[PDB]
Amino acid sequence: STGSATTTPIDSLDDAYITPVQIGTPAQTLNLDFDTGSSDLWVFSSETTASEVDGQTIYTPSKSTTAKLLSGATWSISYGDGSSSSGDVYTDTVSVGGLTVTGQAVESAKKVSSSFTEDSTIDGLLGLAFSTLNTVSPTQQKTFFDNAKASLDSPVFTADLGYHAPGTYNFGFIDTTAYTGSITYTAVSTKQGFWEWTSTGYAVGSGTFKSTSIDGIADTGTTLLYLPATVVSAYWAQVSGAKSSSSVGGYVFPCSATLPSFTFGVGSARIVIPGDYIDFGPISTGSSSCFGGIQSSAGIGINIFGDVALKAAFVVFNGATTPTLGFASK
């Protein structure tokens, strides 16, 4: 089997991407944030504290003939950005782009933090990291991908995120029309539960490539590119007037700037992030200070190849017995 679904930016900045997901019988379609940095499929629901729902579409398990309470199971998750959610668990039928999993754990939110409430466009998350990170207790649950894997034509999924445009998540096949050149594969460590890999270096604009190992995670659920302070300083030094602002929470730059590109290495291959992908617009409405899309990972504890990086590539998440990651230009 295979599946193919379009993923759409939630706003004009590509702050996140939503993908329609069918849950239950008859189908209830929710728009979920596919997150290769976490491993829970959770949804706004009829159980979510009413004051914490503001415009989201909810899953109502009592209206699904295939929903079953997973008795005694609870979940609770906290994300890198400080947001959180928790609740109880159902199993139900879940379909993405025509690919169906029966008995998928659907984690129903009883509580969500303010950042989730305030984002009316995101109805929940669909985790695509390794199932070892799943938070369900006392019996850990599998991700949608882990459940689908054996049935797929090939044990892979791909992320093809657009810049200010829709893109695609495919399951079970590699669309050879969706990228240029070849796909370069690179080793993955699953030790921390992430799609963790080592970039071979970087360049800023038309500058020379610096060969240096940068360990980080491929994370579709993180908006920006978070890299070591040395790398980030070297980038922003090429933008007149750019500075790190403790009050804003990162590097800002004059909205009048033209940003240089940023290149990262994948083995001997190179992925080029155009400068415009690094512009996240005014820090507040009407400001001439703009927020940068490359930020320091210092104090996160890990480097994160988030959407800024991933949307410059066609990315293969290879879930073979020994997982690997592939990157192609597009």
Is the same domain home to 166 and 180? Answer: no
Backbone angles phi, psi at 104, to 5 degrees: -70, 135
CB within 8 A of 67, min separation 6: which ones? 24, 61, 90, 91, 92, 106
What's the rounded Cα separation, in Å, for the pair 210 and 90? 49
DSSP label at residue 44: -
How far is C-alpha 274 from the geometric centre of its chain's CA atoms? 19
Contact 308, 223 (CB under 8 A): yes
Is the same domain home to 161 and 233? Answer: no
Is the same domain home to 89 and 24? Answer: yes
C-alpha separations of 106 from 87, 283, 290 in Å: 10, 36, 38
Consecutive H or E run containing 89: strand 84-96
How would you classify the pairing of strands 279-282 and 314-318?
A: unpaired
Q: Which CATH number does the domain housing residue 180 bear?
A: 2.40.70.10
Consecutive H or E run containing 148: helix 144-148
Backbone angles phi, psi at 195, to 5 degrees: -80, 80
Give me the domain span that covers residue 194. 175-330
What's the rounded Cα separation, in Å, for the pair 279 and 224? 10
Last residue of a domain, one of 174, 190, 219: 174
One-letter amino acid at 115 equals S
CB within 8 A of 233, min separation 6: which ones? none
What's the rounded Cα separation, in Å, for the pair 228 and 187? 20
CA neighbor of 99 nearest in space, from 36, 43, 9, 34: 34
In b/e form, how buried is each residue of 201-215, taking b as 16+ CB within 10 angstroms?
A: ebbbeeeeebeeebe
For the chain, how many helices (H) and strands (E)? 4, 24
One-letter amino acid at 121 equals T
CA neighbor of 260 nearest in space, from 288, 293, 284: 293
Contact 190, 196 (CB under 8 A): yes
What's the rounded Cα separation, in Å, for the pair 238 and 204? 8
Is the same domain home to 155 and 194? Answer: no
Last residue of a domain, one of 174, 203, 232: 174
Is the same domain home to 17 and 155? Answer: yes
Last residue of a domain, one of 174, 204, 226: 174
Structure tokens at 12: 């004009």
C-alpha separations of 57 from 34, 48, 69, 124 in Å: 16, 11, 20, 9
This entry's atomic model was obtained through: X-ray
Sheet holding 250-254, edge to edge: 243-245, 250-254, 289-292, 279-282
Structure tokens at 58: 């909810």
C-alpha separations of 246 from 129, 214, 223 in Å: 31, 25, 19
Is the same domain home to 143 and 277? Answer: no
How far is C-alpha 8 from the geometric centre of its chain's CA atoms? 12
Backbone angles phi, psi at 63, to 5 degrees: -95, 0
DSSP label at residue 133: G
Is the same domain home to 330 and 223? Answer: yes
Is the same domain home to 166 and 83? Answer: yes
Structure tokens at 28: 């209830």
What's the rounded Cα separation, in Å, for the pair 20 and 13? 20
Is the same domain home to 300 and 194? Answer: yes
**Active site amino acids:** 35, 199
Please report the resolution in angstroms.
1.0
Q: What separation, in Å, do the N-terminal and C-terminal C-alpha atoms of the chain show?
A: 25
Task: Give how many domains the chain has, as a whole number.
Answer: 2
Is the same domain home to 212 and 153? Answer: no
Contact 75, 81 (CB under 8 A): no
Is the same domain home to 299 and 241? Answer: yes
Is the same domain home to 156 and 272? Answer: no
